[PDB]
Amino acid sequence: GRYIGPVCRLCRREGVKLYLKGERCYSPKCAMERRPYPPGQHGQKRARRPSDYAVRLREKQKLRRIYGISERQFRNLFEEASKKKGVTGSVFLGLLESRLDNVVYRLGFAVSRRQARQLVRHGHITVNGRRVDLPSYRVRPGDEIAVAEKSRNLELIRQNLEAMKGRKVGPWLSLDVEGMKGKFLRLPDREDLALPVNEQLVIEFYSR
Amino acid sequence: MVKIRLARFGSKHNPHYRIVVTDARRKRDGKYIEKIGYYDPRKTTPDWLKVDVERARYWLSVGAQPTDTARRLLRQAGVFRQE
Amino acid sequence: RNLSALKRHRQSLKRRLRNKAKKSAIKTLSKKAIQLAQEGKAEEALKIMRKAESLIDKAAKGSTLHKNAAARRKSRLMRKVRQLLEAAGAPLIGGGLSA
Amino acid sequence: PKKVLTGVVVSDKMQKTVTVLVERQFPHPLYGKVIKRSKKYLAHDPEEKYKLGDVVEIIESRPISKRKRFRVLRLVESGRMDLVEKYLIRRQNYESLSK
RNA sequence: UGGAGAGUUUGAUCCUGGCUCAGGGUGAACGCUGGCGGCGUGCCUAAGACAUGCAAGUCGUGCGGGCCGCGGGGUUUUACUCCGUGGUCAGCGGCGGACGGGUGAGUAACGCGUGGGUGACCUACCCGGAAGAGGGGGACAACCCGGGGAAACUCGGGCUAAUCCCCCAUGUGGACCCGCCCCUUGGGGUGUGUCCAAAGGGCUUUGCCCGCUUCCGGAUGGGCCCGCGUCCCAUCAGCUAGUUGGUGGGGUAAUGGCCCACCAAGGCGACGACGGGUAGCCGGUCUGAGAGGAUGGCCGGCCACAGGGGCACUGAGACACGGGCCCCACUCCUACGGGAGGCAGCAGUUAGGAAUCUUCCGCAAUGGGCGCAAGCCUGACGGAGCGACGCCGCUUGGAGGAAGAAGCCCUUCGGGGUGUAAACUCCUGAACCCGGGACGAAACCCCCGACGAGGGGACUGACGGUACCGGGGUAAUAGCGCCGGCCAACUCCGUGCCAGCAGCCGCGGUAAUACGGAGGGCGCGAGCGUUACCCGGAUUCACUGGGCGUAAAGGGCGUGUAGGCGGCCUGGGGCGUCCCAUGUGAAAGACCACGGCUCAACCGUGGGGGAGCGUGGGAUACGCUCAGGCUAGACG
RNA sequence: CCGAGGGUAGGGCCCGUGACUGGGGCGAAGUCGUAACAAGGUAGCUGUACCGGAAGGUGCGGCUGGA
Ligand SMILES: [Mg+2]
Ligand SMILES: [Mg+2]
Ligand SMILES: [Mg+2]
Ligand SMILES: [Mg+2]
Ligand SMILES: [Mg+2]
Ligand SMILES: [Mg+2]
Ligand SMILES: [Mg+2]
Ligand SMILES: [Mg+2]
Ligand SMILES: [Mg+2]
Ligand SMILES: [Mg+2]
Ligand SMILES: [Mg+2]
Ligand SMILES: [Mg+2]
Ligand SMILES: [Mg+2]
Ligand SMILES: [Mg+2]
Ligand SMILES: [Mg+2]
Ligand SMILES: [Mg+2]
Ligand SMILES: [Mg+2]
Ligand SMILES: [Mg+2]
Ligand SMILES: [Mg+2]
Ligand SMILES: [Mg+2]
Ligand SMILES: [Mg+2]
Ligand SMILES: [Mg+2]
Ligand SMILES: [Mg+2]
Ligand SMILES: [Mg+2]
Ligand SMILES: [Mg+2]
Ligand SMILES: [Mg+2]
Ligand SMILES: [Mg+2]
Ligand SMILES: [Mg+2]
Ligand SMILES: [Mg+2]
Ligand SMILES: [Mg+2]
Ligand SMILES: [Mg+2]
Ligand SMILES: [Mg+2]
Ligand SMILES: [Mg+2]
Ligand SMILES: [Mg+2]
Ligand SMILES: [Mg+2]
Ligand SMILES: [Mg+2]
Ligand SMILES: [Mg+2]
Ligand SMILES: [Mg+2]
Ligand SMILES: [Mg+2]
Ligand SMILES: [Mg+2]
Ligand SMILES: [Mg+2]
Ligand SMILES: [Mg+2]
Ligand SMILES: [Mg+2]
Ligand SMILES: [Mg+2]
Ligand SMILES: [Mg+2]
Ligand SMILES: [Mg+2]
Ligand SMILES: [Mg+2]
Ligand SMILES: [Mg+2]
Ligand SMILES: [Mg+2]
Ligand SMILES: [Mg+2]
Ligand SMILES: [Mg+2]
Ligand SMILES: [Mg+2]
Ligand SMILES: [Mg+2]
Ligand SMILES: [Mg+2]
Ligand SMILES: [Mg+2]
Ligand SMILES: [Mg+2]
Ligand SMILES: [Mg+2]
Ligand SMILES: [Mg+2]
Ligand SMILES: [Mg+2]
Ligand SMILES: [Mg+2]
Ligand SMILES: [Mg+2]
Ligand SMILES: [Mg+2]
Ligand SMILES: [Mg+2]
Ligand SMILES: [Mg+2]
Ligand SMILES: [Mg+2]
Ligand SMILES: [Mg+2]
Ligand SMILES: [Mg+2]
Ligand SMILES: [Mg+2]
Ligand SMILES: [Mg+2]
Ligand SMILES: [Mg+2]
Ligand SMILES: [Mg+2]
Ligand SMILES: [Mg+2]
Ligand SMILES: [Mg+2]
Ligand SMILES: [Mg+2]
Ligand SMILES: [Mg+2]
Ligand SMILES: [Mg+2]
Ligand SMILES: [Mg+2]
Ligand SMILES: [Mg+2]
Ligand SMILES: [Mg+2]
Ligand SMILES: [Mg+2]
Ligand SMILES: [Mg+2]
Ligand SMILES: [Mg+2]
Ligand SMILES: [Mg+2]
Ligand SMILES: [Mg+2]
Ligand SMILES: [Mg+2]
Ligand SMILES: [Mg+2]
Ligand SMILES: [Mg+2]
Ligand SMILES: [Mg+2]
Ligand SMILES: [Mg+2]
Ligand SMILES: [Mg+2]
Ligand SMILES: [Mg+2]
Ligand SMILES: [Zn+2]
């Protein structure tokens, strides 16, 4: 659950600025542009030679801690994805980006996935009329992730969609800032996605 | 007697009865003889009661006493009608 | 402490006493019929057979016997009376045996 | 349908009883080889024209006696003595597996 | 739609080879920590013993009564209370206690699974149709009187009724011997003979309903039988004498040595009999790439058991959990003559244990019994409580935020680390506050209708004022493991072959990245670890998938029994094989779609496999066998 | 008649235990020899017999994994 708290620490430790804080990670004080070396007392030393297990674990962490998924939730998503008929990584990434908090992040009601987690958990976001208080709520292809009436006049959603006035949501998504909704069109892929994650190493992590 | 009756299934406060033919002896979820229909007593789907009216008529032809509610769920499926 | 299946216990003792009387009467009329037909007798030994046959079919009318146990009782009584009257019987006045 | 089983008799030396040797063959459930696990059934044939060496067929019949739950049906071969000697030596293999 | 490897024998390598490890899992337990909710799930051991409450009753519309509460005179007081009954209390009678629930002791087997057979059968209640229900009696409790017994209860005499029992007739019909064909192991059709029925109750009455008798068919539930699958031990090799078979019986619903007489010597056995150990079996579940291995918890089927053992009775069915009788063990009452008990029902107590809960609410629902119905019972079940036991979901904040505070730990003394992490700035507000508040439930019933179908009516929620919804509202639990390699994550200090670690390798002897602490990190997170057990890795029992010179492994060698295997051309059969439509492969799970709970877990529906195994047809190469021939094998 | 159970007598299988003893593993840098691996200072190993504190020796024979 949320793992907690310190997240530019995980912007570090994998060497890629996977944006978790949001406007901090876009502003020039990310402490990943400032210090690209991993956290720790050693930290800026020689890279310990990344083992074959180490590279798969680091990039599986790059896939996980972008979305903030607890590991058994992630692994049950994976063992649903393997049974789900399709190219396994390129249905797994769409399943990960079809969570409600991630669809709210990609829809830009929040600068971060953890802010989007608070949005969906505190009952702000509605899916198809009624509010859905679940960050793990999957979104079927072709439904309208909207903002309800108690949160339509929110200063946070107002500033977020103010930021998103003119921003580019994905081709598997849509946007409507005049009604603050968005149809989740289809599932995305890695060619659709800006992931710093070779998905194949995450696939290879689970036949351990 | 070969009763048509509502064998319960489904979770706690998720009742989903199954109109079915059993012996009068067996337990509620026992080995039945034929599932003649299903009845959600909550109507959470539009198609919440479905009964195979032909095999319900057959099991009434070979002698059955559908109980105090299986009578109701066959009448709302149109089995006792004569046309 | 108790239950009123004790009514069923005191019913079962009564029914035991009440069908043993029409169960052992079967066996002794069987013995009389077989013995009198074994000693070369006659209609006097077939009246015993019709007596036992009436006793059996009156026993089967309740819970003393099955229909099938009644039929087996008669089919191994009167079959034996007929093959015992084979030995120089000639039932001219014959009752339960069908010519 | 009653069970109908071919077989060669190997013993007839009772009264009203022959012992037929059905040799079913079936693939191994694990290794898949075709193996011939035989089995000896008692049978009934009161006319007793099936001597030790005939090859009969066997119908699943109501129990004539305990283990004697089969009937002979029909002959399909005369004395197949070269097949009955296989078993008649396979029995005589057992005095040498003693202690 | 599917398969990860590594550490370690040596100076080093390769091989074989074992051990160990990372993975998943559970009826779990244990340590540390612990906020919520849903869903499941929870004495695996002592099938040890049980306090206490309940867990099986029900019907006046079958019958007669005692008993008290509204109306009272056949006589000039109720007062043979007869009645109209109005209920309770037992009793007779019928039905239900054989189902539901619990457990794994036993059982290695027709127990189970699975496919058949029942010409060898039953099947109460239910349904289709047939054919009826006419006359008689009788004792047996209640009850009354009397006696015994501490009590349990028991006995004697007198009653008395009923759907209680008995007798007679009618006999559509059915049974039985053979009046004989026919189906062909033991039938509806038959025919003389012989035998057999029955019950009334409520009601609007010259009416139906609830019953009843007999029979035929059904449907379900079974009984029994058989083919096939059914662990380990061969350092268990012979076993069996009712054993095997017959005949004649007896019993059973029925076949059977199921049991008994006489005769006959049989039956079984290296395809594992017998004996021993273990064990409920299966759908499944776990694992697996799959084959397979393990397992049988919860849920579902079946068997077995109800303190151990035996036994029948009643009944449609029991050889009966909460019926009986007996022996034995134990407990409790005893006035010492005897009684009473039976938690492996729910809850619970004790004991063993590492460990497994509440003496909860309720029949609202579904089911079950009785009743015509109201109704009653239901610790079946519906729910709730408890326990991170598991699964799933959620929170412990979010966005800002310093070339970077303090504290702490290193430091090459420069600084670096914890680290946007904190304080603080906003603002979203779990818990909590208030109001509303179910879906779960429309049937039974009442009326129109017909004492049917259809229309109309009302009453009825344990959970629960719960979920949820509407409003307000506080920044509001994080821990555990690990950091030598395997295995992701490293420095300092303290220790000095000690204290200790450990899964293997091994560390520890004064610079320890292996011990103890701090910092930091990694993993997972309301969990993390450990243990045990299982499967995987383990191709380390090798069918897919191993070998045998030296690594573990060729029998000392030959002859040869069982076996296993089998040259070439031909032909039928179609036994293996293969194919085709079915029949089964229950449901639940597994799988796939698509839906309902805020998603998910769960749950519902639909669809598809589904090994097998039976049935019917087809195929004929190959395996088979019978027949024919050949000469390349073999022999002469 | 059968009959659970009890008794008696004798079997079978399995288990605990038993003075003592035979070996076996495993300790601490024990004593005692030096058997083996170098032509282990007697080529070795094995069968078997006998002996010997002990590894072992020898006999007969084999083998080469010895020359
Ligand atoms: Mg923050
Ligand atoms: Mg895998
Ligand atoms: Mg016989
Ligand atoms: Mg190595
Ligand atoms: Mg070595
Ligand atoms: Mg190596
Ligand atoms: Mg090998
Ligand atoms: Mg695996
Ligand atoms: Mg614990
Ligand atoms: Mg219990
Ligand atoms: Mg106990
Ligand atoms: Mg007990
Ligand atoms: Mg009560
Ligand atoms: Mg009564
Ligand atoms: Mg009535
Ligand atoms: Mg239970
Ligand atoms: Mg057992
Ligand atoms: Mg055995
Ligand atoms: Mg045995
Ligand atoms: Mg068997
Ligand atoms: Mg079967
Ligand atoms: Mg009855
Ligand atoms: Mg008296
Ligand atoms: Mg009459
Ligand atoms: Mg009468
Ligand atoms: Mg059947
Ligand atoms: Mg019977
Ligand atoms: Mg018979
Ligand atoms: Mg026998
Ligand atoms: Mg035994
Ligand atoms: Mg098994
Ligand atoms: Mg494998
Ligand atoms: Mg299995
Ligand atoms: Mg069960
Ligand atoms: Mg018992
Ligand atoms: Mg007992
Ligand atoms: Mg018993
Ligand atoms: Mg009876
Ligand atoms: Mg009972
Ligand atoms: Mg029971
Ligand atoms: Mg009993
Ligand atoms: Mg006294
Ligand atoms: Mg005394
Ligand atoms: Mg007494
Ligand atoms: Mg009890
Ligand atoms: Mg009911
Ligand atoms: Mg409940
Ligand atoms: Mg819980
Ligand atoms: Mg904060
Ligand atoms: Mg500081
Ligand atoms: Mg507010
Ligand atoms: Mg506010
Ligand atoms: Mg209502
Ligand atoms: Mg009712
Ligand atoms: Mg209405
Ligand atoms: Mg009412
Ligand atoms: Mg509010
Ligand atoms: Mg590493
Ligand atoms: Mg020390
Ligand atoms: Mg440690
Ligand atoms: Mg020092
Ligand atoms: Mg040190
Ligand atoms: Mg350490
Ligand atoms: Mg293993
Ligand atoms: Mg294996
Ligand atoms: Mg092989
Ligand atoms: Mg070797
Ligand atoms: Mg060797
Ligand atoms: Mg050898
Ligand atoms: Mg040897
Ligand atoms: Mg050799
Ligand atoms: Mg040879
Ligand atoms: Mg041969
Ligand atoms: Mg074939
Ligand atoms: Mg089919
Ligand atoms: Mg299925
Ligand atoms: Mg939904
Ligand atoms: Mg479901
Ligand atoms: Mg379904
Ligand atoms: Mg096959
Ligand atoms: Mg020492
Ligand atoms: Mg010294
Ligand atoms: Mg030497
Ligand atoms: Mg030497
Ligand atoms: Mg030497
Ligand atoms: Mg020498
Ligand atoms: Mg040498
Ligand atoms: Mg000596
Ligand atoms: Mg030596
Ligand atoms: Mg010498
Ligand atoms: Mg020598
Ligand atoms: Zn960042």
Tab-separated table of C-alpha atoms (C1' of nucleotides) in Angstrom, chain E residues 237-434:
chain	number	residue	atom	x	y	z
E	237	A	C1'	5.503	-67.795	-0.557
E	238	G	C1'	2.379	-70.465	-0.134
E	239	C	C1'	-2.888	-69.557	1.357
E	240	U	C1'	-7.892	-71.499	2.159
E	241	A	C1'	-11.436	-77.034	4.776
E	242	G	C1'	-17.705	-73.358	4.355
E	243	U	C1'	-12.521	-72.842	1.849
E	244	U	C1'	-14.180	-74.237	-3.969
E	245	G	C1'	-18.383	-76.805	-6.510
E	246	G	C1'	-23.006	-79.510	-6.816
E	247	U	C1'	-27.837	-81.157	-5.057
E	248	G	C1'	-31.882	-80.406	-1.652
E	249	G	C1'	-33.469	-76.861	1.583
E	250	G	C1'	-33.762	-72.386	5.041
E	251	G	C1'	-33.645	-66.973	5.192
E	252	U	C1'	-33.741	-62.436	2.343
E	253	A	C1'	-37.587	-57.807	-1.433
E	254	A	C1'	-33.861	-60.637	-4.344
E	255	U	C1'	-28.926	-63.756	-6.589
E	256	G	C1'	-25.359	-65.779	-3.769
E	257	G	C1'	-21.519	-70.654	1.006
E	258	C	C1'	-25.888	-65.438	2.927
E	259	C	C1'	-26.561	-70.094	6.388
E	260	C	C1'	-27.424	-75.528	7.076
E	261	A	C1'	-27.416	-81.158	5.799
E	262	C	C1'	-25.167	-84.973	2.114
E	263	C	C1'	-21.567	-85.739	-1.858
E	264	A	C1'	-17.259	-84.068	-4.832
E	265	A	C1'	-11.961	-82.772	-3.933
E	266	G	C1'	-11.769	-78.154	-5.078
E	267	G	C1'	-10.756	-72.315	-5.002
E	268	C	C1'	-6.571	-68.807	-5.013
E	269	G	C1'	-1.238	-67.923	-5.940
E	270	A	C1'	5.095	-64.277	-8.601
E	271	C	C1'	-0.263	-60.742	-13.730
E	272	G	C1'	1.782	-60.808	-6.176
E	273	A	C1'	-2.730	-65.085	-3.368
E	274	C	C1'	-1.908	-64.936	2.063
E	275	G	C1'	0.173	-62.148	6.007
E	276	G	C1'	2.058	-57.282	7.873
E	277	G	C1'	2.239	-51.744	7.784
E	278	U	C1'	-0.601	-47.600	6.396
E	279	A	C1'	-5.162	-45.478	4.597
E	280	G	C1'	-11.782	-43.472	4.369
E	281	C	C1'	-12.465	-43.225	-1.449
E	282	C	C1'	-13.651	-39.926	-5.340
E	283	G	C1'	-15.132	-34.899	-7.871
E	284	G	C1'	-11.262	-32.103	-6.609
E	285	U	C1'	-6.993	-29.272	-4.361
E	286	C	C1'	-1.685	-28.095	-4.445
E	287	U	C1'	2.306	-28.429	-7.610
E	288	G	C1'	4.105	-29.272	-12.423
E	289	A	C1'	6.107	-26.995	-18.674
E	290	G	C1'	3.756	-31.378	-19.374
E	291	A	C1'	3.822	-36.225	-18.127
E	292	G	C1'	3.571	-37.110	-13.392
E	293	G	C1'	4.277	-36.529	-7.759
E	294	A	C1'	1.732	-35.335	-3.294
E	295	U	C1'	-2.959	-34.730	-0.853
E	296	G	C1'	-8.489	-35.695	0.154
E	297	G	C1'	-9.174	-29.641	4.827
E	298	C	C1'	-13.618	-26.528	3.475
E	299	C	C1'	-17.703	-27.631	-0.537
E	300	G	C1'	-20.332	-32.109	-3.326
E	301	G	C1'	-21.144	-37.711	-4.105
E	302	C	C1'	-20.548	-42.750	-1.655
E	303	C	C1'	-19.219	-46.115	2.282
E	304	A	C1'	-18.366	-46.777	7.677
E	305	C	C1'	-18.984	-45.299	12.690
E	306	A	C1'	-22.361	-42.903	16.962
E	307	G	C1'	-18.300	-44.891	24.374
E	308	G	C1'	-15.870	-50.654	22.391
E	309	G	C1'	-18.614	-55.140	20.704
E	310	G	C1'	-22.791	-58.162	19.391
E	311	C	C1'	-27.953	-58.422	18.353
E	312	A	C1'	-32.548	-58.139	16.388
E	313	C	C1'	-37.514	-55.621	16.716
E	314	U	C1'	-40.510	-51.702	14.326
E	315	G	C1'	-40.780	-49.977	9.383
E	316	A	C1'	-41.014	-48.705	2.744
E	317	G	C1'	-36.176	-48.311	4.176
E	318	A	C1'	-32.216	-49.048	10.237
E	319	C	C1'	-29.638	-54.130	12.054
E	320	A	C1'	-30.775	-47.120	13.704
E	321	C	C1'	-26.367	-40.401	16.405
E	322	G	C1'	-30.104	-37.837	20.168
E	323	G	C1'	-35.065	-45.859	19.690
E	324	G	C1'	-34.384	-50.783	22.179
E	325	C	C1'	-31.750	-55.324	24.536
E	326	C	C1'	-27.166	-57.438	26.282
E	327	C	C1'	-21.823	-57.644	27.630
E	328	C	C1'	-17.630	-54.474	28.689
E	329	A	C1'	-15.255	-49.464	30.098
E	330	C	C1'	-16.446	-44.935	32.565
E	331	U	C1'	-19.596	-41.300	35.174
E	332	C	C1'	-23.822	-39.975	38.232
E	333	C	C1'	-28.494	-41.116	41.645
E	334	U	C1'	-29.345	-44.957	45.322
E	335	A	C1'	-32.934	-45.662	50.933
E	336	C	C1'	-27.532	-50.459	48.033
E	337	G	C1'	-32.964	-53.668	45.623
E	338	G	C1'	-31.472	-51.424	41.361
E	339	G	C1'	-31.702	-47.193	38.149
E	340	A	C1'	-29.925	-43.233	34.562
E	341	G	C1'	-26.269	-41.739	30.668
E	342	G	C1'	-23.853	-41.525	25.603
E	343	C	C1'	-21.692	-33.928	22.312
E	344	A	C1'	-17.602	-37.940	16.425
E	345	G	C1'	-25.205	-32.029	16.866
E	346	C	C1'	-24.564	-26.487	17.924
E	347	A	C1'	-22.325	-23.687	21.592
E	348	G	C1'	-19.295	-24.996	25.618
E	349	U	C1'	-16.041	-27.158	29.821
E	350	U	C1'	-11.849	-30.248	30.866
E	351	A	C1'	-7.531	-33.148	29.114
E	352	G	C1'	-3.734	-34.002	25.338
E	353	G	C1'	-1.710	-30.423	22.311
E	354	A	C1'	2.566	-26.089	19.130
E	355	A	C1'	-3.230	-24.868	17.798
E	356	U	C1'	-8.178	-24.005	16.356
E	357	C	C1'	-13.870	-19.535	18.455
E	358	U	C1'	-19.492	-17.673	20.897
E	359	U	C1'	-22.680	-21.777	26.405
E	360	C	C1'	-24.703	-15.331	20.112
E	361	C	C1'	-29.662	-13.639	17.210
E	362	G	C1'	-33.380	-15.640	14.172
E	363	C	C1'	-36.714	-19.102	11.489
E	364	A	C1'	-36.868	-13.102	7.682
E	365	A	C1'	-35.154	-16.369	3.588
E	366	U	C1'	-34.049	-21.525	1.318
E	367	G	C1'	-34.545	-26.598	2.770
E	368	G	C1'	-36.742	-30.673	5.981
E	369	G	C1'	-40.803	-32.991	8.984
E	370	C	C1'	-46.067	-32.874	10.542
E	371	G	C1'	-50.784	-30.372	9.377
E	372	C	C1'	-56.311	-29.518	4.865
E	373	A	C1'	-54.578	-24.725	6.438
E	374	A	C1'	-53.345	-21.348	10.257
E	375	G	C1'	-49.500	-23.071	12.689
E	376	C	C1'	-45.466	-25.730	15.195
E	377	C	C1'	-40.502	-27.671	15.239
E	378	U	C1'	-35.681	-27.052	12.668
E	379	G	C1'	-28.067	-25.166	16.835
E	380	A	C1'	-30.163	-27.841	8.740
E	381	C	C1'	-29.491	-23.167	7.761
E	382	G	C1'	-29.640	-17.492	7.219
E	383	G	C1'	-26.563	-14.196	9.756
E	384	A	C1'	-23.654	-12.043	13.651
E	385	G	C1'	-19.440	-12.311	17.164
E	386	C	C1'	-14.068	-14.097	17.848
E	387	G	C1'	-8.819	-15.362	15.380
E	388	A	C1'	-4.192	-11.033	9.998
E	389	C	C1'	-5.665	-18.336	9.311
E	390	G	C1'	-5.880	-17.354	3.827
E	391	C	C1'	-7.562	-14.494	-0.424
E	392	C	C1'	-9.024	-9.646	-2.081
E	393	G	C1'	-9.598	-4.399	-1.456
E	394	C	C1'	-8.303	0.180	1.397
E	395	U	C1'	-5.873	3.667	4.721
E	396	U	C1'	-1.635	5.383	7.440
E	397	G	C1'	-1.853	11.449	3.159
E	398	G	C1'	-1.361	14.621	-1.424
E	399	A	C1'	0.965	19.008	-3.751
E	400	G	C1'	4.752	22.568	-2.545
E	401	G	C1'	9.399	22.796	-0.139
E	402	A	C1'	17.017	23.686	0.616
E	403	A	C1'	22.822	23.045	-3.073
E	404	G	C1'	20.155	20.751	1.357
E	405	A	C1'	18.375	22.851	8.959
E	406	A	C1'	18.875	20.198	13.590
E	407	G	C1'	19.785	15.300	15.229
E	408	C	C1'	22.358	10.784	13.681
E	409	C	C1'	26.347	7.895	10.712
E	410	C	C1'	30.634	8.021	7.865
E	411	U	C1'	34.467	11.335	6.552
E	412	U	C1'	40.336	11.721	2.546
E	413	C	C1'	38.021	16.927	7.315
E	414	G	C1'	36.874	19.283	1.796
E	415	G	C1'	32.302	17.279	2.673
E	416	G	C1'	29.005	13.248	1.829
E	417	G	C1'	24.692	10.323	3.769
E	418	U	C1'	19.602	9.945	5.991
E	419	G	C1'	17.051	13.559	1.845
E	420	U	C1'	11.707	16.456	-0.219
E	421	A	C1'	12.789	13.001	3.867
E	422	A	C1'	11.478	16.595	8.047
E	423	A	C1'	9.372	21.573	10.165
E	424	C	C1'	6.277	24.880	7.814
E	425	U	C1'	2.715	26.627	3.320
E	426	C	C1'	-1.748	25.228	1.378
E	427	C	C1'	-6.226	21.202	0.589
E	428	U	C1'	-8.094	16.384	0.123
E	429	G	C1'	-10.284	14.943	4.491
E	430	A	C1'	-9.988	7.486	6.824
E	431	A	C1'	-11.833	7.383	11.477
E	432	C	C1'	-15.534	9.807	13.765
E	433	C	C1'	-20.827	13.432	13.888
E	434	C	C1'	-25.807	13.973	12.186
